[PDB]
Design a binder for this molecule. Sequence first.
Ligand SMILES: CC(C)CCC[C@@H](C)[C@H]1CC[C@H]2[C@@H]3CC=C4C[C@@H](O)CC[C@]4(C)[C@H]3CC[C@]12C
Lengths: 250, 140, 115, 168, 278
Amino acid sequence: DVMEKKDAWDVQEFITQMYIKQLLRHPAFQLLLAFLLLSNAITIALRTNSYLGQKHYELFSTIDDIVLTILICEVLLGWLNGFWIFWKDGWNILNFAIVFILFMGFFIKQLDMVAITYPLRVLRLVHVCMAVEPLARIIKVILQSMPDLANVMALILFFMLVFSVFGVTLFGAFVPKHFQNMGVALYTLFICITQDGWLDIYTDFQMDEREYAMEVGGAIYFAVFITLGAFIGLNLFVVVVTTNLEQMMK
Amino acid sequence: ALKSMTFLLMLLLIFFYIFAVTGVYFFREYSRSTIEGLEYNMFFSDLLNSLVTVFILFTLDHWYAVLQDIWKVPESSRVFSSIYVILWLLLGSIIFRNIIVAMMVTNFQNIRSELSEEMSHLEVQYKADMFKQQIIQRRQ
Amino acid sequence: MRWRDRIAVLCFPPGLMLTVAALILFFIHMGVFASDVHNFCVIHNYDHMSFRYTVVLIFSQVISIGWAAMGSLYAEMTGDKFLRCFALTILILNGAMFFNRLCLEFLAINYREER
Amino acid sequence: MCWVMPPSVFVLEYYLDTLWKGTMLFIICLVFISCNVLREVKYQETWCFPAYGMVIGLWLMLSSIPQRRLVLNHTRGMYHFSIQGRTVCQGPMHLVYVRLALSSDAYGGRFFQLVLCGHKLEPLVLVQLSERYEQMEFLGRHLARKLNINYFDYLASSYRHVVRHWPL
Amino acid sequence: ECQAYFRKVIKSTFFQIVMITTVTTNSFLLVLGTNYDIQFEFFRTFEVSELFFVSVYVCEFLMKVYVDPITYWKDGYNILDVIILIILTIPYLLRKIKGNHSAYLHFADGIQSLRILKLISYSRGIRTLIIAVGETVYTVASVLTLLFLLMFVFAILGFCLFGVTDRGDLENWGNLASAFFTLFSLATVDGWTDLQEELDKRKFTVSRAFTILFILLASFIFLNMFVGVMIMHTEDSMKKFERDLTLERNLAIMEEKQIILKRQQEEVNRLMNTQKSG
Ligand SMILES: CC(C)CCC[C@@H](C)[C@H]1CC[C@H]2[C@@H]3CC=C4C[C@@H](O)CC[C@]4(C)[C@H]3CC[C@]12C
């Protein structure tokens, strides 16, 4: 109201207001962080070539140290406002896990090597580029669509199993190497459901009797199952997509 | 629906026309080369063959294998040709498939909209008829 | 009020904790820095260098810098110029200290170990 | 617990949780003391990070707070700032308030806390439930039934906040 | 001074008819030039027609070099067509009379196709369609950026999984461009079977699981997300246009009814006045 004289908690609130005004609302610091991340992403794309690497490996190490120390500085600044709020968050958990894995693999000896150092960096790149507005709405609804997609995946896999029981009857020890092993058979039926270039399989189970045999029966059974499952799966995918986006425009 | 197909179809065919006639003389050194071992050579030979192969790219069947069969051309650092055909196939396929499915579901939307407004008008007319029946009954 | 009772029990006045901690860190770090320059210049007994503790005191250095800055920020609003001068001076000496020891460490590479 | 705390018969009493923080620090560092990692191949010993644990913890146990109280008894008490032993702050009204405070992150999520404002007073932080406004002014009304003083909302006076005493 | 007369001339439909005729003859020139005989033989007609076409396009740039760039520098189709004119004029300027250090011939049918694009720049109905679909540019750019991010993530992942070990699988998860193209194919449905048969022999059993996981994320997410986003973006863009058209029709109907009522009231008043005066 009047605020004749401030108190200690008002001073602390004003300090936290200053701390959230900088580095969280100021576009300059976020732009600098994005510029550094884009520069090290350029160095990422400059990899897979020892001809550039032989004069860049030490600079690569230095920029790795720089990006690691600025990431842990940002994490410490987020921790400063409070560990409880940072721990109870949807994306700060992911960022903390990213920096924890990167720092442990850096300081402590680890077999994590390039296959962890580089994808973690590009995951941080994705996380930072989510912050700027004209990708956050689109990203927000991809994660909103996965709970409604999970039931579709569950139904698809259950139907896939209960029709693979029909599948494994005409499978095993004949027309083998893609119909046997009961996991290769499942994944090969998944390939044929994804529906591209299955005439290798068609020629594989071709010539049983050259006229009808089971070459008629099993082939038409699995063909109608494949076409029905593919149509139903694609329809359900686009249906869940249209439902959740109708949610985002509602 | 096919009455509603007025401008999108000629947009589709004119994009097909311009992209096919651009891609005629892009992989020219594919069909017009002295390589003995090749099997997709005739795909990029004639203008009609060019139409057929860009329609194949539009349908998006074995685009991987088409690209590897054109990779037998001496790789000139892929600076213009491979990115052109890849961009053409991806943009044309997704843009046209998406635009047709969007406009078809829009057609279903206005079909159901006019149906629903017809039933709403019928219900309003029924309410007015019942009210006027009360008015007539009180008028006797 | 009664600063006897303020300094006696149960609490400390706001700030003036991190400043004193930075002072004692400054004291122990002049001790080790003087020992390092002494043994690097004359007596030459590198087996008893601080070649063994190299990263934990660097961590102590940066956290002392942070606490000095944080105490300066927490004590600036007192409205008194002496406290601000105190905090700025201790921050400046700690920072120049840090640059000096970083330069000394970077000069002393070829004497520790090789990977 | 919803009915026990609103009356707060006569005095209130309060404490701090830095003892808790120093407690898990002491447990963690005592764990660190015995059988830590053996990184002599790293040409470094990491026993001095626990030495800083010693220092930070011992300093945090040096902050002992016996029963922070006031003169909030349901009388014409002056709300003088009272500790067992020493006493610091006194005031004829116009300093004790109960104010709602808000905090925001980069995303924009709002977190609501309460602070008993005054000359080095203690806050009114509720137990880990701040996502919605719920009822707000009802707890201020219970405080008003207690010894009606204030209930201050965010930003300036405007509306939606209550005052009982004013020094004009 | 004469700017009003020049604008009236450019608004006259005869000029546009001549323009469309010239660029349709250019389209026929491209049709005959994609053949071999007419490309370099019996080509005096080709030469004179091409000179006429480039003269017409020069006149186009001359009438677009006015003060109208003050609106051409912020609009859509206008900046598009002047950019098309620039990237038409410069390449045949450095190609037809080259005398320079260019690489080879690959931008002749491309130039002619840009001319055909300038032809199709007409048809105001297609212009309205372009306007109606033009608000999804930011959305498709965002989906393209998400796609590219996923390609980069799985590009570094496929490299780290199959090309650093250097025991085979080269030019599929090896070199960067070939790896990117194989990943684009795996994100599509094409080539997945032969790619799987190529990768299963490299003593990497979990590569099959990784590739099928990559398919079930990338292909489904990209295809279904794109078709959705376009479907309701266009649905909501058509909806507002249709409701606005119906609102305009309703306003016109209301105005006609009000005009009829005013005419009836005036007729009644005139009849009453004549009855009073007679
Ligand atoms: C924990 C905070 C307060 C920092 C305190 C750091 C203390 C514990 C560290 C920093 C500097 C260190 C000393 C530096 C140099 C020497 C000489 C060497 O031949 C043996 C170790 C010895 C004697 C170290 C003992 C531990 C030491 C005093």
